[PDB]
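Training component of the fellowship. As part of building independent skills, the fellow (R.M.) carried out the full modelling exercise for a liganded target. The chosen ligand was 0Z3. The inputs are recorded below so that the supervisory panel can assess the work.
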Amino acid sequence: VVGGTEAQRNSWPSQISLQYRSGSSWAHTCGGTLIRQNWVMTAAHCVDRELTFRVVVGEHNLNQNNGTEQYVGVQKIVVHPYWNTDDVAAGYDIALLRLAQSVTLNSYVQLGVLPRAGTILANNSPCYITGWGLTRTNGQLAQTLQQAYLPTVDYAICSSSSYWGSTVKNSMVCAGGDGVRSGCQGDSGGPLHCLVNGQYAVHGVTSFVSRLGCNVTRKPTVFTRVSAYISWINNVIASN
Ligand SMILES: CC(C)c1ccc(NC(=O)[C@H](Cc2ccccc2)NC(=O)[C@H](CCCC[NH3+])NC(=O)C(F)(F)F)cc1
Ligand SMILES: [Ca+2]
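Fellow's submitted model of the complex:
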């Protein structure tokens, strides 16, 4: 998160860190959203490498014991059947991970509330992106969870010439684009939380930014529109 602020410890409890095994250690690669005590929603591109992965719920400071973390292994990865590694602009950048154990819910670990199927947010809707990714373009991971106020840019505006054009599809949410605040590498998979009827709901899964830089005027951060995937999500959790 470029142009972010430090999140309070309990503000966003459905946020997880997706980490992979590096030598004796574990490194953060992506965010996610806890959606069931044993299921995480993240972006499909986050698990395209065949790495050993773990999820950390209740995490705040990556590099420090918070006294609130639960570590759980990933048991099963279901990516969207239509996801293509070579074409992120096609969409379908969503995956579901079955955890090896059910996590315990407390004020640090909560399930994220999903939107009703088909819900589109009006332009300039109040949303927040959270994550541990790069705080500058080509910078470094944050060690505490950051948040940034990122209002949505609706599809007409976002798919216009000036903006993402043809690269954005109606299965995506655009948010931000002011050249100051943005999602950046390592925030992929994470939540875009939007305040709806007095309730925060997870409307985006972070998917991409520009090839030119994270915080670029008129190139909003792009998210998988979660409400486009509610029947697939339910259908996976029911069977698996
Ligand atoms: C400055 C220049 C090197 C530059 C190049 C690319 C970007 N970023 C990008 O275009 C964004 C990174 C990103 C994702 C989500 C949120 C924020 C940022 N990258 C993506 O869309 C890829 C998805 C690859 C799909 C194929 N397997 N994301 C990533 O792999 C991740 F996790 F590291 F962030 C930003 C800057
Ligand atoms: Ca920690």
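The panel noted the following from the submitted structure. DSSP finds two helices and 14 strands in the chain. The pocket of calcium ion (ligand 2) is lined by residues 59, 61-62, 64-66, 69 (CB under 6 Å).
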